[PDB]
């Protein structure tokens, strides 16, 4: 049995400025990769011996993914700020945790897609991987929008596809 | 980098017949596939979408598209088309990293020809509302199968066929107009006429 | 590899 | 609902056009596309959230501003005839899921001296058709207009009619040889013969033409080809 996890966190800075974004990956609850925007030259770097054997273009690619995720987090911070009717001076934190539990053979056993806002849980994809759970009434808005656009299908593309395969490849180097 | 291909720019099909519009795209390990429809004089509306799962995305209007990983396609089918389905159909795709930036096909203009029950072909002569001498020729009530061709004279003018629907009594009729400023009714329309039409 | 959220909340 | 303005605009090379788009949804993505026959839809500029601006596939000649979450502007400061197209605004809050506006038709002219409002005429039903099919077909015809930028509608007794109407989906050139040839356009309205034979019924073929603005400079000796509605009519006749 195995598992893969990504924790992507963004913290808005007061007034003028752009959020601090960090992203970390865990294979079997061991950190193997890390991104930070504060870094002098923000890129994805390996936090474990084996991941070093991956070609430069891998790092460039996933670094690009991080560079998009930044924008996503900035904008959706603004959105959640709006839903909760909060002053735009406040410092706020938005986190996305997502991953996959893979069984002994290699099949997908569980999928994970969840979002928290300012420490509290906002919205989480259920075990059936097609239904969401929403903590409050803003999360009810997000839930409605995502039921309508079918975000579960979009995430299932990853959970059932890239997640399992890349987890297997990351285990190939252990 | 991504490229989308629709092979036939213009498609004509009979009403109630079976339709297939084709969409082939460049390879992608992460294909997000869409069909948009554009009815005349409007913008595009999303018809169908696919991110993952059951590759048969089933529309409620009878349309359905199917994603083929092997063929690398996303073809649009309808078992029995309605006359309202006459529109321009675009398929679009996006990939990971540009999920929100689509690549469009060139589109396919779909003409749904109506099944005329009682073809009573005719070429009438209509006079101006004001200047009684200036007139216009009208070929009407011909079936969908016949085909109007442009002028040979180049100083005579002929419009392509045109379906109108008198919905208040469920009646549909084809129509083509000819005019020139040596002009009659029979001399015009020198292409593929059905003999049994009133003059 | 990480994913992209894309969907606006 | 996505709205854009103006729906129709005519300008001369070196002109200054500003296409406004406003969305009622609170979507983060907004896009400016152009649609041309042969090229289909081509992205010009887009925007992810207010203040953001990103380069599309064909941004040359265009500029854009995303002032607010709801508003997106497309700016053509030095108009070019190449920029003659049909512009669409779109919005999205989901990957590849787009909501379009109804379109904005832009015409850019190299010179103004070849601009003509159309001549509209209505042709009254044939007694032959009326006797045979028990229906009456009126034909509106709008000739000699430039540029190709008109809207034809039918009006029976003060109401605009959409039933039993058929306008050409595309006009034909009066002399296909010339590059700046004028255009012609035809439409048909069919009604029951008993309706056409009532002298109390009034039939109007109305053609909205888009031409020169009023502030636009004009230096020819003849009637100025401004934006106008040219109309033709026919009354019912029992006979």
PDB file of N, CA, C and O in Angstrom, chain A residues 78-114:
ATOM      1  N   UNK A  78      -8.837  36.392  -3.448  1.00  0.00           N
ATOM      2  CA  UNK A  78      -9.768  37.516  -3.651  1.00  0.00           C
ATOM      3  C   UNK A  78     -11.248  37.080  -3.606  1.00  0.00           C
ATOM      4  O   UNK A  78     -12.081  37.706  -2.928  1.00  0.00           O
ATOM      5  N   UNK A  79     -11.563  35.989  -4.303  1.00  0.00           N
ATOM      6  CA  UNK A  79     -12.930  35.457  -4.334  1.00  0.00           C
ATOM      7  C   UNK A  79     -13.489  35.106  -2.949  1.00  0.00           C
ATOM      8  O   UNK A  79     -14.588  35.543  -2.571  1.00  0.00           O
ATOM      9  N   UNK A  80     -12.733  34.306  -2.202  1.00  0.00           N
ATOM     10  CA  UNK A  80     -13.145  33.901  -0.864  1.00  0.00           C
ATOM     11  C   UNK A  80     -13.261  35.098   0.072  1.00  0.00           C
ATOM     12  O   UNK A  80     -14.107  35.109   0.968  1.00  0.00           O
ATOM     13  N   UNK A  81     -12.405  36.097  -0.135  1.00  0.00           N
ATOM     14  CA  UNK A  81     -12.488  37.343   0.623  1.00  0.00           C
ATOM     15  C   UNK A  81     -13.853  37.979   0.390  1.00  0.00           C
ATOM     16  O   UNK A  81     -14.507  38.439   1.331  1.00  0.00           O
ATOM     17  N   UNK A  82     -14.280  37.988  -0.872  1.00  0.00           N
ATOM     18  CA  UNK A  82     -15.609  38.465  -1.227  1.00  0.00           C
ATOM     19  C   UNK A  82     -16.776  37.682  -0.638  1.00  0.00           C
ATOM     20  O   UNK A  82     -17.719  38.277  -0.128  1.00  0.00           O
ATOM     21  N   UNK A  83     -16.728  36.354  -0.718  1.00  0.00           N
ATOM     22  CA  UNK A  83     -17.816  35.521  -0.190  1.00  0.00           C
ATOM     23  C   UNK A  83     -18.092  35.774   1.290  1.00  0.00           C
ATOM     24  O   UNK A  83     -19.239  35.752   1.735  1.00  0.00           O
ATOM     25  N   UNK A  84     -17.032  35.989   2.058  1.00  0.00           N
ATOM     26  CA  UNK A  84     -17.166  36.091   3.503  1.00  0.00           C
ATOM     27  C   UNK A  84     -17.386  37.528   3.979  1.00  0.00           C
ATOM     28  O   UNK A  84     -17.520  37.780   5.177  1.00  0.00           O
ATOM     29  N   UNK A  85     -17.435  38.455   3.029  1.00  0.00           N
ATOM     30  CA  UNK A  85     -17.641  39.867   3.323  1.00  0.00           C
ATOM     31  C   UNK A  85     -16.578  40.400   4.280  1.00  0.00           C
ATOM     32  O   UNK A  85     -16.901  40.960   5.323  1.00  0.00           O
ATOM     33  N   UNK A  86     -15.309  40.221   3.922  1.00  0.00           N
ATOM     34  CA  UNK A  86     -14.200  40.608   4.799  1.00  0.00           C
ATOM     35  C   UNK A  86     -13.436  41.834   4.292  1.00  0.00           C
ATOM     36  O   UNK A  86     -13.314  42.038   3.081  1.00  0.00           O
ATOM     37  N   UNK A  87     -12.930  42.645   5.222  1.00  0.00           N
ATOM     38  CA  UNK A  87     -12.118  43.814   4.883  1.00  0.00           C
ATOM     39  C   UNK A  87     -10.879  43.397   4.100  1.00  0.00           C
ATOM     40  O   UNK A  87     -10.270  42.370   4.398  1.00  0.00           O
ATOM     41  N   UNK A  88     -10.510  44.192   3.099  1.00  0.00           N
ATOM     42  CA  UNK A  88      -9.413  43.827   2.204  1.00  0.00           C
ATOM     43  C   UNK A  88      -8.036  44.128   2.797  1.00  0.00           C
ATOM     44  O   UNK A  88      -7.015  44.014   2.114  1.00  0.00           O
ATOM     45  N   UNK A  89      -8.013  44.506   4.069  1.00  0.00           N
ATOM     46  CA  UNK A  89      -6.761  44.673   4.783  1.00  0.00           C
ATOM     47  C   UNK A  89      -6.263  43.381   5.410  1.00  0.00           C
ATOM     48  O   UNK A  89      -5.078  43.248   5.719  1.00  0.00           O
ATOM     49  N   UNK A  90      -7.166  42.419   5.589  1.00  0.00           N
ATOM     50  CA  UNK A  90      -6.845  41.193   6.299  1.00  0.00           C
ATOM     51  C   UNK A  90      -5.845  40.283   5.614  1.00  0.00           C
ATOM     52  O   UNK A  90      -5.822  40.182   4.392  1.00  0.00           O
ATOM     53  N   UNK A  91      -5.005  39.629   6.409  1.00  0.00           N
ATOM     54  CA  UNK A  91      -4.130  38.577   5.901  1.00  0.00           C
ATOM     55  C   UNK A  91      -4.864  37.236   5.975  1.00  0.00           C
ATOM     56  O   UNK A  91      -5.379  36.858   7.033  1.00  0.00           O
ATOM     57  N   UNK A  92      -4.921  36.528   4.845  1.00  0.00           N
ATOM     58  CA  UNK A  92      -5.660  35.267   4.765  1.00  0.00           C
ATOM     59  C   UNK A  92      -4.870  34.117   4.130  1.00  0.00           C
ATOM     60  O   UNK A  92      -3.963  34.340   3.323  1.00  0.00           O
ATOM     61  N   UNK A  93      -5.234  32.892   4.510  1.00  0.00           N
ATOM     62  CA  UNK A  93      -4.544  31.678   4.078  1.00  0.00           C
ATOM     63  C   UNK A  93      -5.495  30.720   3.365  1.00  0.00           C
ATOM     64  O   UNK A  93      -6.554  30.377   3.886  1.00  0.00           O
ATOM     65  N   UNK A  94      -5.120  30.296   2.166  1.00  0.00           N
ATOM     66  CA  UNK A  94      -5.902  29.310   1.434  1.00  0.00           C
ATOM     67  C   UNK A  94      -5.020  28.113   1.115  1.00  0.00           C
ATOM     68  O   UNK A  94      -3.919  28.277   0.579  1.00  0.00           O
ATOM     69  N   UNK A  95      -5.494  26.915   1.453  1.00  0.00           N
ATOM     70  CA  UNK A  95      -4.712  25.706   1.218  1.00  0.00           C
ATOM     71  C   UNK A  95      -5.489  24.649   0.444  1.00  0.00           C
ATOM     72  O   UNK A  95      -6.683  24.441   0.665  1.00  0.00           O
ATOM     73  N   UNK A  96      -4.785  23.993  -0.472  1.00  0.00           N
ATOM     74  CA  UNK A  96      -5.306  22.904  -1.279  1.00  0.00           C
ATOM     75  C   UNK A  96      -4.459  21.665  -0.992  1.00  0.00           C
ATOM     76  O   UNK A  96      -3.251  21.682  -1.196  1.00  0.00           O
ATOM     77  N   UNK A  97      -5.087  20.608  -0.487  1.00  0.00           N
ATOM     78  CA  UNK A  97      -4.423  19.322  -0.289  1.00  0.00           C
ATOM     79  C   UNK A  97      -5.046  18.306  -1.236  1.00  0.00           C
ATOM     80  O   UNK A  97      -6.271  18.192  -1.318  1.00  0.00           O
ATOM     81  N   UNK A  98      -4.211  17.581  -1.970  1.00  0.00           N
ATOM     82  CA  UNK A  98      -4.740  16.590  -2.900  1.00  0.00           C
ATOM     83  C   UNK A  98      -3.786  15.425  -3.111  1.00  0.00           C
ATOM     84  O   UNK A  98      -2.572  15.597  -3.072  1.00  0.00           O
ATOM     85  N   UNK A  99      -4.332  14.237  -3.340  1.00  0.00           N
ATOM     86  CA  UNK A  99      -3.479  13.080  -3.509  1.00  0.00           C
ATOM     87  C   UNK A  99      -4.223  11.790  -3.748  1.00  0.00           C
ATOM     88  O   UNK A  99      -5.430  11.791  -3.996  1.00  0.00           O
ATOM     89  N   UNK A 100      -3.498  10.679  -3.665  1.00  0.00           N
ATOM     90  CA  UNK A 100      -4.081   9.378  -3.957  1.00  0.00           C
ATOM     91  C   UNK A 100      -3.500   8.274  -3.081  1.00  0.00           C
ATOM     92  O   UNK A 100      -2.287   8.216  -2.854  1.00  0.00           O
ATOM     93  N   UNK A 101      -4.381   7.415  -2.577  1.00  0.00           N
ATOM     94  CA  UNK A 101      -3.977   6.170  -1.940  1.00  0.00           C
ATOM     95  C   UNK A 101      -4.088   5.047  -2.961  1.00  0.00           C
ATOM     96  O   UNK A 101      -5.162   4.784  -3.517  1.00  0.00           O
ATOM     97  N   UNK A 102      -2.958   4.394  -3.202  1.00  0.00           N
ATOM     98  CA  UNK A 102      -2.858   3.298  -4.150  1.00  0.00           C
ATOM     99  C   UNK A 102      -2.653   1.977  -3.410  1.00  0.00           C
ATOM    100  O   UNK A 102      -1.800   1.877  -2.531  1.00  0.00           O
ATOM    101  N   UNK A 103      -3.445   0.969  -3.766  1.00  0.00           N
ATOM    102  CA  UNK A 103      -3.360  -0.336  -3.135  1.00  0.00           C
ATOM    103  C   UNK A 103      -2.061  -1.086  -3.379  1.00  0.00           C
ATOM    104  O   UNK A 103      -1.135  -0.568  -4.004  1.00  0.00           O
ATOM    105  N   UNK A 104      -2.000  -2.317  -2.880  1.00  0.00           N
ATOM    106  CA  UNK A 104      -0.796  -3.136  -2.970  1.00  0.00           C
ATOM    107  C   UNK A 104      -0.377  -3.391  -4.416  1.00  0.00           C
ATOM    108  O   UNK A 104       0.792  -3.226  -4.770  1.00  0.00           O
ATOM    109  N   UNK A 105      -1.338  -3.787  -5.247  1.00  0.00           N
ATOM    110  CA  UNK A 105      -1.074  -4.091  -6.653  1.00  0.00           C
ATOM    111  C   UNK A 105      -0.669  -2.857  -7.464  1.00  0.00           C
ATOM    112  O   UNK A 105       0.322  -2.880  -8.196  1.00  0.00           O
ATOM    113  N   UNK A 106      -1.442  -1.785  -7.330  1.00  0.00           N
ATOM    114  CA  UNK A 106      -1.177  -0.561  -8.059  1.00  0.00           C
ATOM    115  C   UNK A 106      -2.443   0.180  -8.446  1.00  0.00           C
ATOM    116  O   UNK A 106      -2.380   1.261  -9.029  1.00  0.00           O
ATOM    117  N   UNK A 107      -3.597  -0.403  -8.128  1.00  0.00           N
ATOM    118  CA  UNK A 107      -4.882   0.219  -8.438  1.00  0.00           C
ATOM    119  C   UNK A 107      -5.125   1.423  -7.533  1.00  0.00           C
ATOM    120  O   UNK A 107      -4.547   1.514  -6.450  1.00  0.00           O
ATOM    121  N   UNK A 108      -5.973   2.348  -7.977  1.00  0.00           N
ATOM    122  CA  UNK A 108      -6.372   3.470  -7.129  1.00  0.00           C
ATOM    123  C   UNK A 108      -7.327   2.985  -6.039  1.00  0.00           C
ATOM    124  O   UNK A 108      -8.309   2.292  -6.325  1.00  0.00           O
ATOM    125  N   UNK A 109      -7.037   3.351  -4.792  1.00  0.00           N
ATOM    126  CA  UNK A 109      -7.830   2.892  -3.652  1.00  0.00           C
ATOM    127  C   UNK A 109      -8.618   4.030  -3.003  1.00  0.00           C
ATOM    128  O   UNK A 109      -9.736   3.830  -2.524  1.00  0.00           O
ATOM    129  N   UNK A 110      -8.031   5.222  -2.987  1.00  0.00           N
ATOM    130  CA  UNK A 110      -8.755   6.399  -2.522  1.00  0.00           C
ATOM    131  C   UNK A 110      -8.229   7.667  -3.193  1.00  0.00           C
ATOM    132  O   UNK A 110      -7.058   7.738  -3.564  1.00  0.00           O
ATOM    133  N   UNK A 111      -9.105   8.654  -3.374  1.00  0.00           N
ATOM    134  CA  UNK A 111      -8.714   9.923  -3.960  1.00  0.00           C
ATOM    135  C   UNK A 111      -8.968  11.064  -2.999  1.00  0.00           C
ATOM    136  O   UNK A 111      -9.869  10.987  -2.161  1.00  0.00           O
ATOM    137  N   UNK A 112      -8.174  12.125  -3.115  1.00  0.00           N
ATOM    138  CA  UNK A 112      -8.289  13.252  -2.196  1.00  0.00           C
ATOM    139  C   UNK A 112      -8.180  14.582  -2.913  1.00  0.00           C
ATOM    140  O   UNK A 112      -7.201  14.837  -3.613  1.00  0.00           O
ATOM    141  N   UNK A 113      -9.195  15.419  -2.719  1.00  0.00           N
ATOM    142  CA  UNK A 113      -9.203  16.789  -3.210  1.00  0.00           C
ATOM    143  C   UNK A 113      -9.918  17.636  -2.160  1.00  0.00           C
ATOM    144  O   UNK A 113     -11.141  17.571  -2.038  1.00  0.00           O
ATOM    145  N   UNK A 114      -9.165  18.411  -1.380  1.00  0.00           N
ATOM    146  CA  UNK A 114      -9.791  19.267  -0.369  1.00  0.00           C
ATOM    147  C   UNK A 114      -9.154  20.647  -0.187  1.00  0.00           C
ATOM    148  O   UNK A 114      -7.954  20.834  -0.374  1.00  0.00           O
TER     149      UNK A 114
END
